[PDB]
Every structure is written in C-alpha cells, then in structure tokens.
C-alpha cells in the first residue's frame, strides 16, 4: 500500500519486446533524444477587499481599525518606520523604508510567476489554503542583488512588506522576492524594532558575505577579462558575467567554502540516468546566484567519470542563496553501483553492440544545506515546522526559508518531488525494498551471469544502494541497521552495506563485513574499495600463520 | 584518627602475600624482610613503597630506612596520623 512499493512490484510497462516465449514489456528504457521546437512556447476578478480599497474603505475592512482611519498599531508602525524612532552610511547594513501612499498601495492576491510550475494543490498549500486571499503591499525595506550579478554587490530589487487586512493580531509579512509564496513570507509582529531586527539579520549576513568573498569574486572577474582577451571573445558586462559563471567550473575544490557555515543537513534528490539535467535545473534557479562557487559537469562517458563499483567518487558543485547567503553543496555520487563488471567484455560487447534499447541508470544526487546559526532569519521554528507538515519534508528548525524554497522549487521544476526526501523517507524506502525482496521478483530481460551480467537493476542491488543512501544521509542508527540487515543480505546487499559502513566511518564494522564475506569477486572488490596496508588485514578474520608469526589488524581498523 | 593495628596488619599482610617475590605460606605476622623472608635490601624498598601505595601517607627517607620488618611497618602506620 505504498507508491514506491507499487513501483517496485508492478513496473510501468512502457516499451514491449516480443520473443518466442514471452513479451518483456516492462523495461526502464532511456528517454528519446530531446528536441528543441521553436513553435513550442517557453511560458506554457477583483476581490471585495481590493474593491473597498479602490473605493476608499480599506481602513474599514481593516478589523482592528476605525471605520474611517488606519489602525492604531499600523499608524504607529508606519510612523516608526518612517522616522526611525524606536529601535555616508553603508548601503549593505542600512535598512531603508519606502512607505507607499494609499493611492500607491498594491492590494491583491499572490500571483505566481508565469514560469512557476506548481500543481493546484501545491499552489493552494503555498497560498495557505486560500488562493483568493488578498494582501496589501505598502512598503519595501531591503534590496538584494540581481541573480545574474556578482554575489557581492548592492541590492537592486527590494523585499516587500504586506499586511493582511483582516486578521485578529498585528502581523507584517516580509517577502524576500516574487518567487517566495505567502507560505514562506516571514510573519513578524507589528513592532518596528522586530521588523528592523529581522531585516538587520539579512543585512549583516550580506555584509559578511561581501567582506568574505568580494576580493575572490573580483579576482575571478579579472581572470575572466584576461581570458576573454586571450580567446578573442567580445568583452562586455554580460560577457564577463557569463565567463565568470563558466569559470565557476574551473574553480578548484580545495579552496571551496564548503564548511563556511556551522550547521549542515543532507537531502536525497533522487536517482538520474542523466543528472546533468537536474544540475541544469539547479543552475537555472531564481533563488540562487548564476555565478556559483564551484561547478562540476557530470559526463558519465568521460574516462575519469565512468561509474564503477569502486567508482571515481563524487562530482561536487556549490551554489549560493541570494537572500540568506546559505550554501547548497550538490553531490552526484558515481560510486554507488553494486554490480560487478563482466568477466569477458568481448561477449558483453557482442551482446549489447547493436541493441537499440538501453536501460535506465540509477545515479544518486544529494544536497547539503549549509547555514549559520540564526534566530530570526529562518522565520522561527514554527514556519519550517508548518512547511514540513504541509509538504511531508524533513527540514531543520533553523534552515533558511530561502534555501528551503530553492530546493522545493528546483525539485518541483525537475519533477522529482517524490524522490526528494530525507532520513525518514529513506528509511521508508528501505522498508519498502525489504518487503520487495521478501516478495518474489519479476523476471528481467535475461538472467545475470558473472560472464554476461544484466544491466537492469534488481531488488537486491536497489536495497544495497539505498542502504548506501541511508548511510550518506547521516542516519544516527545506520550502524545498528547495517548490523541487523547483514545476516539476511545477499551479495550485492552486503557490498552496499560495506560501502555504507565505509561512508558512515565505522572501520571496525567494515572489517567485520569484509571478514564475514565469503571469498569471491565481491570480497575482492570490497577490499579494493579502500586504502589498505595488506589485503590479508581485511580478508583474514583469524591471523594466518606466516613464518611462525601472527599479524593483527584490529588496532589498524578500529575506530 | 588512629587506625587499629588489626586493620593495618590485614592490609600489609595482603600486600606481602600478593607480592612478586614473597611466598604466601612463607610469610608470618612476626617476620623480617631480609632474614625471615629472604629478600634483598633493594626488595625491602619495593615492599615499603608498595605499602606507601595503599596508605596514601608519605614516609620520609630517614623514617623509611628504619622499617626492616613487618612489625616496624605496622607500628609506623599506627602512630602516623595520616593513615587513611
């Protein structure tokens, strides 16, 4: 009674393949080549409160107000924000306030951008159950730099301030940008000091980001100018911005600010035959700067990025959030495979040389949200708890709403909202895979063989890969789960458990798994996985007598 | 304040019995380290320092060179006010 369990047991049955005995119609075939069509477009009534505002009865619609004049708390808040009463300047730290007039207010409901692709239920949840609910934009407080601009620049698009005309308590909603729905508008009290502190948090974060990375960004700017001069390319402002966003690829890994901020959390974005599409989706996100700190083009057909059982590793990219200056560390893992290579490559090549259908690839992508300790930048714990209870996600109580909405928008635009999950979702998927392994499995195209293996993924391989994913997601009981799952595991599942223990960092458990593994190609590859002294240190459980002596590797592989 | 000689004798007897050189049955409550037990003077220092390990009190060098028998060790701890 689960969607993922149903997808495991009964597949989609897309493409049929006829034979002399059966018809294998359930195969995860690679999508056809994409085609760009110029004919296909890219984009793809006034309410009562607004009418009363137009007629002049907005203060009458206001509940806590007089039938003629604005509310007392609202008038006091406007006076304080206009005269800086209660609490050559730096524009990054300074918090302006542009109060609008009654004829200048913007009364109406939240209108999603023309490119915002959300379902009806998702738009309802982002509008908090009422899409027709209208707000009154009256002032703009703080500006953030443009997406395409250098991340260390002054703000140009100001954040908006709304007030719900009909509410019981004084609430001011702070919207960072048009891409943030009212479900993530920061609800602050009617206190001018509260608004000032909420905006000063973002101001201080922007000032810190500038002071930390402006010199590096300007050095990259100079490098881009010099490289344009060398390559004889046109030298303009947009050209330099594009070349900086490109050299984000050539940026080195050692000098990347991956651990710039204290707190961090992990999320699983699903498995992709071509994770470059998801990477392009992340690159084209309105809530992230177009010039990332580091970019890695995942090309599975490159000799250094071919996914193997002891694969090349992890392709890493680092993006910066525009409004909260948090970090998104995208990690494409090319080493999660638990399938052994063919014993004779010539036969496998003869078998798959002329085949016009290739199976899907299961390549995991993770994202690490890195953020600093904040008290008023995440909108309090209640905002994120509401977001979690609404969208079935597992976010921390202090993760910035900017990064939260960035991840949500990216996953929804890519179409993997079901694949986007955390530790709880990964545990549920692991339970589903255990149930699927208990159930009988359907027949694939042809049975696997050490000589000619089957490229299609089986339930045991999926279970091993998901054990690896649960270890990667920093599960606190990952070692206990591996210990409980090892006695009832197959060979690919034990390989996945070894990789998962190695990822979690339990060298003793890894050595136990390697010593319990019976001798074979699986044991050889799980020994080759790590940097070791001698293979016997991992393979031999009991010390093998060598020259009337006994070696001991427990101190070498403990902790 | 002053510990009874019975409890002080039980501790020092357990040390000399569990010692690396003194045999179990060879020890007696009235014995000498060098003559009755057959130890050297360098071993007398070790059995004295072993007693100072269980009795937190610190013995000066002059008072330590006087303890050459188990009877002297019991009487010293008895009169010592630092007998824990």
């Amino acid at each position: 009674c689960s969607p993922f369990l149903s997808s495991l047991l009964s597949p989609v049955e897309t493409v049929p393949l006829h034979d002399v005995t059966r018809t294998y119609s359930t195969m995860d075939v690679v999508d056809p080549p994409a085609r760009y069509n110029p004919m296909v477009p890219n984009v793809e009534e006034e309410g009562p409160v607004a009418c009363a505002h137009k007629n002049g009865k907005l203060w009458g619609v206001f509940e806590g107000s007089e039938d003629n004049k604005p509310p007392a708390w609202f008038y006091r808040l406007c006076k304080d924000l206009f005269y800086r009463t209660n609490s050559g300047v730096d524009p990054y730290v300074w918090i302006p306030f542009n109060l609008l007039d009654e004829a200048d207010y913007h009364v109406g409901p939240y209108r999603f951008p023309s490119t915002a692709t959300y379902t009806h239920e998702q738009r309802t949840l982002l509008c908090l159950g009422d899409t027709r609910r209208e707000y009154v934009h009256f002032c703009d407080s703080y500006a953030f730099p443009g997406r395409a601009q250098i991340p260390t620049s002054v703000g140009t698009c100001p954040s908006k301030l709304y007030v719900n005309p009909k509410q019981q308590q004084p609430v001011v909603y702070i919207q960072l940008s048009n891409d943030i729905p009212p479900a993530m508008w920061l609800p602050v009290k009617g206190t001018a000091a509260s608004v000032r502190r909420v905006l000063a948090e973002f101001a201080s974060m922007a000032a810190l980001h500038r002071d930390w990375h402006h010199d590096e960004f300007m050095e990259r700017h100079a490098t881009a100018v010099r490289m344009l001069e060398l390559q004889r390319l046109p030298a303009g402002e947009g050209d330099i911005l594009r070349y900086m966003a490109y050299d984000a690829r050539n940026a080195q890994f050692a000098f990347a600010p991956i651990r710039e901020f204290p707190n961090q959390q992990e999320f699983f974005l699903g498995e992709h035959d071509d994770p470059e599409k998801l990477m392009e989706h992340v690159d084209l996100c309105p809530l992230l700067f177009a010039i990332p700190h580091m970019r890695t083009v995942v090309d599975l057909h490159a000799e250094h990025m071919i996914p193997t059982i002891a694969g090349p590793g992890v392709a890493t990219s680092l993006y910066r959030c525009i409004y909260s200056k948090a970090l998104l560390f995208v990690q494409v893992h090319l080493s999660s495979e638990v399938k052994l290579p063919p014993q004779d490559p010539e036969a496998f090549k003869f078998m798959w040389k002329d085949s016009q259908v290739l199976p899907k690839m299961r390549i995991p992508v993770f994202v690490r949200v890195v953020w600093p300790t904040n008290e008023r930048m995440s909108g309090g714990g209640g905002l994120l708890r509401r977001f979690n209870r609404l969208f079935g996600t597992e976010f921390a109580s202090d993760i910035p709403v900017d990064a939260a909405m960035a991840l949500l928008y990216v996953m929804q635009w890519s179409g993997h909202i079901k694949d986007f999950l955390g530790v709880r979702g990964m545990r549920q998927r692991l339970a589903d895979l255990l149930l699927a392994s208990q159930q009988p499995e359907p027949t694939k195209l042809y049975p696997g063989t050490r000589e000619i293996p089957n490229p299609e993924y089986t339930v045991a391989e999926r279970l091993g890969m998901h054990v690896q994913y649960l270890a990667q997601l920093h599960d606190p009981d990952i070692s206990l789960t591996i210990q409980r799952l090892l006695p009832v595991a197959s060979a690919p599942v034990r390989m996945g458990c070894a990789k998962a223990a190695l990822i979690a960092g339990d060298r003793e458990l890894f050595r136990h798994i390697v010593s319990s593994e019976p001798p074979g190609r699986m044991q050889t590859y799980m020994t080759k996985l790590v940097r070791k002294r001698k293979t016997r240190d991992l393979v031999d459980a009991e010390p093998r007598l060598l020259e009337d002596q006994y070696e001991f590797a427990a101190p070498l592989w403990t902790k | 304040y002053l510990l009874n000689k019975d409890d002080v004798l039980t501790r020092v007897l357990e040390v000399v019995k569990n010692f690396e050189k003194v045999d179990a049955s060879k020890v007696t409550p009235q014995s000498h380290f060098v003559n009755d037990l057959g130890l050297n003077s360098l071993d007398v220092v070790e059995v004295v320092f072993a007693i100072e390990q269980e009795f937190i009190l610190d013995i000066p060098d002059h008072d330590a060179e006087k303890i050459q028998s188990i009877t002297d060790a019991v009487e010293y701890i008895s009169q010592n006010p630092m007998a824990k």
Binding site: - | L42, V45, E46, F49, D61, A64
Partner: protein, 58 residues
Amino acid sequence: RRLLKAGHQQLLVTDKSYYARKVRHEFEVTARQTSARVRGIMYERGQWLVENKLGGIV
C-alpha cells in the same frame, strides 16, 4: 628509593614497571660489574637525575 618515588611521582607516558625494572637492573648488575670509582660516578649521576627530574624521562 628516591629514584623510584620520583619516577612514580612524575612518570606520565613511560611505563612505571619498565622504569623500575631498568633501575633495578642498573643497581643490581651494572655497579657489580664495573669498578668502585664508576660505582660512585653512577651514584652521583643518580643523584643528579633525582634533582633534575630523571634527566628528561617524560
């Protein structure tokens, strides 16, 4: 006794058992092998060790 007590007072990483064994071996075999003048030299050097914290034995 001074050497043994000083070692057990300030002997952090070095094995106290091994230190006592080394001191016993010295006092028991090295002096009995060498001459009396070298015995006195060893006595003076042991006093120097007691006064200078075992000569750097950490």
